[PDB]
Amino acid sequence: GARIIYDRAFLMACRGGGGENLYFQGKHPLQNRWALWFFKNDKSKTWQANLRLISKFDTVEDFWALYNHIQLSSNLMPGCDYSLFKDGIEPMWEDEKNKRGGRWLITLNKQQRRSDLDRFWLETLLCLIGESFDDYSDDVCGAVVNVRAKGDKIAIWTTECENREAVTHIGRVYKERLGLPPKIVIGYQSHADTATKTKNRFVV
Amino acid sequence: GARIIYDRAFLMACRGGGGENLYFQGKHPLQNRWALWFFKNDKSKTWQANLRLISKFDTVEDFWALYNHIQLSSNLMPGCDYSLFKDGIEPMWEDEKNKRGGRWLITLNKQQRRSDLDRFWLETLLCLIGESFDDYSDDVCGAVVNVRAKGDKIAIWTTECENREAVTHIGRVYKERLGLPPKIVIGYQSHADTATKTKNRFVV
Ligand SMILES: CC[C@H](O[C@H](C)CO)c1ccc(-c2ccccc2F)cc1NCCO
Ligand SMILES: CC[C@H](O[C@H](C)CO)c1ccc(-c2ccccc2F)cc1NCCO
């Protein structure tokens, strides 16, 4: 049918009042299937054994079941990365869907770990699963949270750094959904530029 | 050793670049040996003369040799059934390994005979031979394709309809590997229920 779009209030209502959809034995299907990955760079193990597929889901209710479980069981320590990517896109630059891409980046201060990290990450996840960028949601690959002593980072990765209209729409809506004051500028950088380098390619 | 698991890309690469394994004079052995059966209900012959063992194989390269041959020489007409089952499991409910079982069913409409039947059947076969359900692949008995004017059907048969964790894992991974949109619900039904009866026992 048409793209399955859910707004923030609808998704939030499914957490405590989910499972009452009119089909799918009550589950609300998502537009896309998503995979959650965990990474921690531990030099004692291989890179392969450091990247872990945690879980895949494709309904609102299964997203919340995973969210609730992670909220109870998972490591929030420096050096952890968590990534939510569309099924079939590995959470790495070399994936065919990421090689030409880039990311909208949010950088937090340490004071913002207690005030803002959880709420900004949740808002990011809802933008993803809810297809909040209308047709330009198709350019979204995934999102990454890096937990770091120097300051945590959240990013939305998109497929094509030269798709100006898609990339800028995603950034504007993401900023709006995060609720950031206008004066707090966020930037988009291609993955190629992040490999070796406010002055970003696009700013909103 | 450990379970022999092959992903889709590896299996696909063996079709045109097969026979270069480091042992077995180049063949890649499968975890299981498999038997391909054909059935057509023809009232002029007995039931036993209507069920035919076509061939058995136990390597990736011999799977592709059979695939290529069937693709050239075999009947695709309404009333045909083809079944790929682990060696020693007959493709019938009464087999000891199927009596307590059930199936994940995919039902096609006629527009999907040309767009989807071959690709969905191939993806099913790759899930089977590649042991794509990890430890729960041991609950897989086989798969069946029914060619019908009213709409073709593909199913994965499993051994125990009350093994909830195994059955549900198989269904989720099968749906993921078929690439079905989240909103396209597939259902599991016990063979006992198929004998006399969206509302299925498990849905994913
Ligand atoms: C492990 C805690 C981690 O914390 C972040 C850094 C801030 O929140 C984290 C990771 C992934 C998910 C997640 C869950 C379901 C689907 C997709 C996901 F990415 C949720 C959480 N944390 C929830 C509690 O805040
Ligand atoms: C008409 C041939 C039939 O078509 C199906 C319905 C759709 O594709 C069919 C049956 C069995 C196999 C098969 C081959 C090797 C191992 C196991 C198998 F089940 C392959 C094909 N078709 C290949 C594409 O022509």
Residue numbers in the entry:
A (entry chain A), B (entry chain B): 10 to 206, 211 to 217
What did the original publication write about this model?
Eukaryotic initiation factor 4E (eIF4E) serves as a regulatory hub for oncogene-driven protein synthesis and is considered a promising anticancer target. The eIF4F complex includes a core of eIF4E, eIF4G and eIF4A5,6. eIF4E recognises and binds the mRNA 5’cap, and recruits eIF4G to provide a scaffold function for the eIF4F complex, while eIF4A is an RNA helicase that is stimulated by binding to eIF4E and eIF4G8. Here we screen a fragment library against eIF4E and identify a ligand-binding site with previously unknown function.
When compound 4 was profiled against the major variant of eIF4E (D127), the protein ligand crystal structure showed a similar binding mode for both variants. A small change in flexible loop conformation (around L85) was observed for the major D127 variant compared to the minor N127 which may in part explain the 5-fold reduction in binding affinity (Kd = 0.09 µM; LE 0.38). Thermodynamically, binding of compound 4 to both eIF4E variants was driven by a large favourable enthalpic contribution with a small entropic penalty. Comparison of the compound 4-eIF4E structure with that of an eIF4G peptide51 bound to eIF4E suggested that this conformational change would potentially impact on binding of eIF4G due to steric clashes between residues H78-N84 from eIF4E with residues D638-L641 from the eIF4G peptide. Compound 4 treatment disrupted eIF4G binding to eIF4E determined by co-immunoprecipitation with an eIF4E antibody from SW620 human colorectal cancer cell lysates. Consistent with this mode of competitive binding, incubation of cell lysates with a peptide (RIIY; RIIYDRKFLMECRNSPV)56 derived from 4E-BP1 inhibited binding of both eIF4G and 4E-BP1 to eIF4E. This contrasted with compound 4 treatment, which did not disrupt 4E-BP1 binding to eIF4E even when eIF4G binding was lost.
